[PDB]
Amino acid sequence: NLLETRRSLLEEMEIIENAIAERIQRNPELYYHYIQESSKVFPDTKLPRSSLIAENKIYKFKKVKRKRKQIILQQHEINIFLRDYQEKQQTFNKINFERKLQQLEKELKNEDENFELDINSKKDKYALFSSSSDPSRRTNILSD
């Protein structure tokens, strides 16, 4: 079944888009410092208001300013997120009846005594790409 593969690829693309936007939420300067340098390279690119830069806000709320090391860390961390994002996208482009229902469901009767909870599909992917995933609670921002 390719349909599960196409869903699991689109979900992993959705989490990475939900991952890096959490960073741009907690640090607007990640996108802001970037779009300053692209504007002198690709002059077509529209950058937001000057007030949104200096007050370090996106819609209403001003965040706390970060030092250069934590910003550039996340700029290379979102970089390997985007490489994961494009790698999955490439394979996803390269992959994308009643009796066959019951034939698999009888094969789903195999191994009934599997006494084990399984919540590790949507959770191990979300925790892999979220902030502060390496320490016990909060020591290092870097994701798993």
């Binding site: 907690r26 007050e55 806000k57 209403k60 709320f61 001003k62 965040k63 706390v64 909060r138």
Partner: peptide
């Protein structure tokens, strides 16, 4: 992470022996 701005019987109980801490296991 998220601190954003916008834009009376005192001597009696010692005599009677109250408030002396004691426990039953």
């Amino acid at each position: 992470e998220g601190a954003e701005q916008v834009d009376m019987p005192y001597w009696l109980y010692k005599l009677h022996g109250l408030d002396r801490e004691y426990r039953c296991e």
